Design a protein around this ligand. Structure first.
Ligand SMILES: Nc1ncnc2c1ncn2[C@@H]1O[C@H](CSCC[C@H](N)C(=O)O)[C@@H](O)[C@H]1O
Length: 738
């Protein structure tokens, strides 16, 4: 009764499926599969479904506890099966368990290193886990050298017990240990960071006096974790705005619990007022008419200038597209002594304070650029000014709501400063002349005029071509652009047009209707197509009738610089909903790129060996999380050396299916001798065969991307290389051959 008496579990699991019961079905399928390897492929997909829905049931009951073990059993049943590994990793990633799905993606890649989707998902998980700026920090030789010198000077002064807050890779704890610290303790909130910090400390042979903890500093207890109050506290929990990573609260906790009567010792914040057209394009709507659509003055847009995410942006002002003008002189904003618990407490209960700065160059007030000097001690200090090429960035406070932004010689800039929520907040920015929440990409979209001009022209062309008078009931226009878009309002002016906007914000819909009224629109015209209860994007149907669409504005390019996923599938869906003459915008897309030499991209993607880290071996452990593509790039101010001519890497036709090829190859003319390190790329969107939008143009809101290489390639002027390009459904892969 071992062979026959089995699949009664299967016949009961069918009944359980009929009753929406997945636990009994999962257990029955476990019984059937673990007793019959012959059925592993017969009920593969049904078991997959059963386990997915049972895991959803378990997550609804807050039973991750056993959900992870259930997924582990599912793996145990199927050994080398990269398909199940990948699919289950995506299901774990979807439920919010990235720290756990990372291992499943790693195993899926280990079973087949050529699995496309496995690697393309592992890169997502690694980008979410390890943060990019870490790579820029470990490669800062100046930062590492100065921190090592300061920690050594502190240890030689009598500090034998050192605690590292925000240890990350544990390189600061290793600096302390190598300097001769007796007791070294480190803490890091991230699971993955603790994970590879263990590896780094072990391989560098320092697990003796370095005790690692997986917790925030605010969770440390004495003597439960560390046995005593330490004599030294090191940390690098600082950002562009210093307080952005919460050093104040952590150091208040450290002085109140874990310290004897701190590196860094102090900080002096400096600021300046800058003119910059790019910052203005990203954080201020300059134009008041958008291709014939008048924006009313009572509807004022703003960027995330908050009043709880950062109320400022971060920019590398040392390489801003175009440049920047210093309208004033570098002036002090505040000073923080990290060896002052009184001041650290008073900053929370501190009221704002005003500062006035004179103008030295007449221009346009566009932003407030803020950096700081981190005083490790009386000797060592690290600056983050744009004149210094370090790893850090500069904080940028935008300037909203002023009658005139022109400042002259003799005027001042008056501003309040406050650190009331441990976040550097500069407010009340005004100029005494001497006697909607749109994102940065949305602001730059409104500021981008050629986009709207070309869209209006192509829309008018197609609409007039579809009207019966020239073809020999109003026309329907669909806009599925992700975010704010005035394209439906533009289309509404071109005759009997029914525009549909997929914008999902209530605020944005109200604003679009107010703008329509400002343009004397019948309010019934602009209909908002936010249709769903829980759908990712506005899934594509026809209107209330099957009267097929005339114009469908798809979203093809992600503002990160990559091609937006499910593009060809959504285009194939949309092609069936067009009438005999309809159009999908864009009509096609040409992906262009070139080969360059950039040390900047190399050091942005991965760590450059023990050179930068001063002997300590950290690159092999952290470069496991390096990704092949840099996103959100401005090729306008990219520090590199071009090595070839820009060529077409890909074509993507959205009206024609059978065109968009797969494994294409391109021959590239190497027109300069050097070292290929990366492949930047951008796009040209052809709406009409005449009209073209250049995503690399300095008026575009989009960003460019770049495939960064692991090992730089040596080439000479006159050589010709080959590039293999794959458009795998929702991803683009660019590999090289000599
Ligand atoms: N109070 C705290 N306790 C533990 N980790 C913290 C923390 N505050 C911030 N962090 C984390 O520490 C990380 C900083 S890494 C900064 C230092 C760098 N890893 C080095 O040793 O050279 C951030 O990812 C942040 O999330």
């Amino acid at each position: 009764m071992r062979d026959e008496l089995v699949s009664r579990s299967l016949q009961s699991a069918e009944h359980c499926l009929g009753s929406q019961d997945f636990g009994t079905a999962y257990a029955h399928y476990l019984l059937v599969l673990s007793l019959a390897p012959e059925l592993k492929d017969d009920v593969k997909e049904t078991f997959q479904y059963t386990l997915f829905r049972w895991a959803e049931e378990l997550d609804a009951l807050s039973r991750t506890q056993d959900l992870l073990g259930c997924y582990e059993q599912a793996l145990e049943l199927f050994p080398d099966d990269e398909v199940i590994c990948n699919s289950m990793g995506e299901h774990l990633f979807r439920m919010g368990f990235r720290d756990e799905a990372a291992g499943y993606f790693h195993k899926a890649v280990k079973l087949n290193p050529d699995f496309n989707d496995a690697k393309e998902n592992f890169y997502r998980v690694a980008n979410w886990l390890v943060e990019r700026w870490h790579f820029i920090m470990l490669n800062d030789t100046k930062r590492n050298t100065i921190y090592n010198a300061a920690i050594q000077k502190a240890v030689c002064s009598g500090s034998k017990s050192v605690l590292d807050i925000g240890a990350g890779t544990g390189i600061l704890s290793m600096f302390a240990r190598k300097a001769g610290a007796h007791s070294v303790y480190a803490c890091e909130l991230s699971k993955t960071m603790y994970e590879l910090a263990c590896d780094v400390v072990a391989a560098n042979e320092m697990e003796e006096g370095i005790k690692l903890l997986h917790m925030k500093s605010l969770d440390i207890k004495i003597p439960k974790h560390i046995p005593e109050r330490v004599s030294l506290v090191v940390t690098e929990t600082v950002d562009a705005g210093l307080f952005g990573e919460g050093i104040v609260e952590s150091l208040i906790h450290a002085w109140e619990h874990l310290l004897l009567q701190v590196i860094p010792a102090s900080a002096v914040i400096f600021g300046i007022a800058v003119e910059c057209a790019e910052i203005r394009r990203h954080h201020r709507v300059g134009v008041k008419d958008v291709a014939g659509i008048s924006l009313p003055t009572n509807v004022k847009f703003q960027s995330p200038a908050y009043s709880t995410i950062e109320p400022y942006t971060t920019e590398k002002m040392s390489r801003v597209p175009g440049g920047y003008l210093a309208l004033t002189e570098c002036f002090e904003i505040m000073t923080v002594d990290f060896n002052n618990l009184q001041e650290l407490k008073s900053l929370a209960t501190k009221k704002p304070d005003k500062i006035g700065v004179p103008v030295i160059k007449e221009g346009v007030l566009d932003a407030i650029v803020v950096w700081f000097v981190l005083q490790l001690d009386d000797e060592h200090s690290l600056s983050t000014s744009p004149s210094e090429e370090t790893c850090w960035e500069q904080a940028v406070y935008p300037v909203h709501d002023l009658a005139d932004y022109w400042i002259k010689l003799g005027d001042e800039v008056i501003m309040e400063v406050s650190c009331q929520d441990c976040y550097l907040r500069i407010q009340s920015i005004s100029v005494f002349h001497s006697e909607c929440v749109l994102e940065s990409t949305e602001i730059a979209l409104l500021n981008n005029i050629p986009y709207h001009e070309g869209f209006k022209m192509a829309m008018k062309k197609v609409l007039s071509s579809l009207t019966p008078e020239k073809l020999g009931e109003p026309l329907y226009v669909l806009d599925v652009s992700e975010g704010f878009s005035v394209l439906p309002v533009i289309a509404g002016t071109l005759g009997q047009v029914k525009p549909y906007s997929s914008v999902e914000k209530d605020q944005h819909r109200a604003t679009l209707d107010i703008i329509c009224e400002a343009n004397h629109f019948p309010k019934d015209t602009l209909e908002f197509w936010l249709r769903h209860v829980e759908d990712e994007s506005a899934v594509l149907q026809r209107p209330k009738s099957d009267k097929l669409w005339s114009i469908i504005i798809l979203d093809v390019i992600e503002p990160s610089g990559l091609i937006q996923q499910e593009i060809m599938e959504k285009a194939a869906i949309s092609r069936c909903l067009l009438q005999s003459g309809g159009k999908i915008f864009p009509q096609y897309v040409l992906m262009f790129g070139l080969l360059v030499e950039s040390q900047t991209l190399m050091e942005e993607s991965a760590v450059q060996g023990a050179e930068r880290t001063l002997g300590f071996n950290i690159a092999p452990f952290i470069n496991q999380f390096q990704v092949p593509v840099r996103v959100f790039l401005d090729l306008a101010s990219l520090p590199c050396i071009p090595l070839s001519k820009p060529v077409e890497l890909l074509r993507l036709d959205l009206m024609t299916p059978y065109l968009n090829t797969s494994n294409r190859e391109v021959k590239v003319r190497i027109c300069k001798s050097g070292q290929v390190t990366a492949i930047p790329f951008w796009y040209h969107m052809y709406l009409d065969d005449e009209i073209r939008l250049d995503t690399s143009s300095e008026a575009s809101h989009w960003k460019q991307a770049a495939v960064v290489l692991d090992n730089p390639i040596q080439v000479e002027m006159g050589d010709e290389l080959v590039l293999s390009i794959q458009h795998h459904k929702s991803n683009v892969s660019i590999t090289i051959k000599q």
